[PDB]
Enzyme design. Structure first.
Site, PDB file in Angstrom:
ATOM      1  N   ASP A 133       0.846  -1.187   0.000  1.00 17.75           N
ATOM      2  CA  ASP A 133       0.000   0.000   0.000  1.00 17.75           C
ATOM      3  C   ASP A 133       0.884   1.240   0.000  1.00 17.75           C
ATOM      4  OD1 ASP A 133      -2.900   1.071   2.001  1.00 17.75           O
ATOM      5  OD2 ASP A 133      -2.076   1.731   0.073  1.00 17.75           O
TER       6      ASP A 133
ATOM      7  N   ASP B 207       0.764   5.030   0.331  1.00 18.22           N
ATOM      8  CA  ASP B 207      -0.134   6.072   0.813  1.00 18.22           C
ATOM      9  C   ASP B 207       0.316   7.444   0.328  1.00 18.22           C
ATOM     10  OD1 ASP B 207      -2.037   4.558   2.149  1.00 18.22           O
ATOM     11  OD2 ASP B 207      -0.937   4.586   4.047  1.00 18.22           O
TER      12      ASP B 207
ATOM     13  N   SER C  76      -5.893   3.565  -5.287  1.00 18.36           N
ATOM     14  CA  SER C  76      -6.635   3.290  -4.069  1.00 18.36           C
ATOM     15  C   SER C  76      -7.935   4.098  -4.055  1.00 18.36           C
ATOM     16  CB  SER C  76      -5.759   3.601  -2.854  1.00 18.36           C
ATOM     17  OG  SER C  76      -5.361   4.959  -2.833  1.00 18.36           O
TER      18      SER C  76
ATOM     19  N   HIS D 164      -2.207   0.624  -4.800  1.00 16.07           N
ATOM     20  CA  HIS D 164      -2.087  -0.746  -4.322  1.00 16.07           C
ATOM     21  C   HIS D 164      -1.276  -1.544  -5.327  1.00 16.07           C
ATOM     22  CE1 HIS D 164      -6.186  -0.244  -2.063  1.00 16.07           C
ATOM     23  NE2 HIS D 164      -5.196   0.379  -1.448  1.00 16.07           N
TER      24      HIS D 164
ATOM     25  N   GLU E 146       3.046   0.655   3.365  1.00 23.38           N
ATOM     26  CA  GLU E 146       2.531  -0.441   4.172  1.00 23.38           C
ATOM     27  C   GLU E 146       2.587  -1.739   3.381  1.00 23.38           C
ATOM     28  OE1 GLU E 146      -1.108   0.357   6.418  1.00 23.38           O
ATOM     29  OE2 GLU E 146      -1.201   2.341   5.506  1.00 23.38           O
TER      30      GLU E 146
HETATM   31 MG    MG Z   1      -3.363   4.063  -0.284  1.00 23.61          MG
END
Ligand code: MG
Ligand code: MG
Length: 273
Positions: A78, A80, A108, A115, A139
């Site tokens: 992930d 961000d 996302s 992603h 992540e």
């Molecule tokens: Mg995201």
């Protein structure tokens, strides 16, 4: 569209699908067959993609999700806050990762992250979440959690690939109870709120430090670890001041001020919630 994506067809070979709805600032997964909240570790709370799509319609959910398990081959990466307003990558580390990890990539749900879904296993020396200075974060997960699935393919990367992921160590921080006493102080009204303007923040620090001295047994190291996860933490905490730092002087004054100490013989306290 979404049913024509090769990665979706690979993921649809698993009965690990949920639906999610946006509630407050988080996305809650739901059992697509009865509309109740779904556990990330109970396999019979999920469904296949046919059931998830029917439940998405039936309950008015916002999108599909997919629960990762240790047994399936998938890893969830992930990225961000890595996209600008025109959905172009704006973080250099993210641009580098995409150059070195080429696999299924989608935008996302919030529209400013990515992603990446890979077939493989994570390195054991990287931390689950790494935060960078510009507000972006990385992540990685391979089990115990669901990912939202948007089908918004990025740069035409519509296929899950088998890849070694050791080079994720270039991007994620390397790794080598506190949360109990946190939860204890929270449920007993002893956990501070974020300061509002007009508050004497330094006075909020001392009041919270005093409560920390009691609940932490005057364990200065625990108190410090605990303060750094609180809404009162700020850069001033580590500020050099006289012989040490503002934070360290605050915690030591707390230890000298409080008399009583919480010993897990279940004792109680001088300060009111
Ligand atoms: Mg995201
Ligand atoms: Mg897995």
């Amino acid at each position: 569209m979404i049913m024509e994506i090769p990665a979706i067809k690979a993921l649809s070979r698993y009965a690990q699908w949920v639906i999610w709805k946006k509630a407050a600032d988080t996305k809650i997964p739901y059992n697509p067959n009865n509309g109740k909240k779904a556990s990330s570790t109970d396999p019979l709370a999920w469904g296949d993609i046919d059931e998830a799509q029917a439940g998405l319609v039936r309950y008015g959910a916002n999108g599909l999700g997919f629960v990762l398990t240790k047994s399936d081959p998938f890893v969830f990466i992930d990225l961000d806050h890595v996209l600008d307003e025109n959905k172009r990558v704006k973080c250099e580390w993210a641009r580098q990762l995409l150059k070195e990890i080429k696999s299924y990539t989608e935008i996302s749900p919030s529209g400013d992250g990515l992603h990446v879904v890979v077939s493989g296993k994570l390195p054991d020396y990287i931390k689950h979440k790494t935060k960078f200075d510009d507000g972006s974060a990385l992540e990685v997960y391979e089990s115990g959690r669901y990912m939202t699935i948007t089908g918004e393919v990025f740069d035409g990367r519509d296929d899950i690939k088998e890849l070694d992921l050791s080079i994720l160590g270039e991007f994620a921080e390397h790794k080598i109870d506190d949360e109990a006493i946190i939860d204890l102080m929270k449920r007993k009204g002893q956990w501070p709120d974020a300061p509002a303007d007009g508050d004497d923040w330094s006075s909020l620090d001392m009041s919270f430090a005093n409560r920390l001295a009691f609940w932490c047994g005057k364990d200065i190291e625990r108190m410090d670890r605990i303060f750094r996860q609180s809404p009162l933490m700020r850069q001033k905490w580590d500020r050099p001041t006289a012989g040490s730092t503002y934070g360290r002087i605050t915690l030591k004054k707390a230890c000298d001020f409080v008399d009583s100490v919480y010993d897990p013989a279940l004792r109680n306290e001088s300060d009111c919630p």
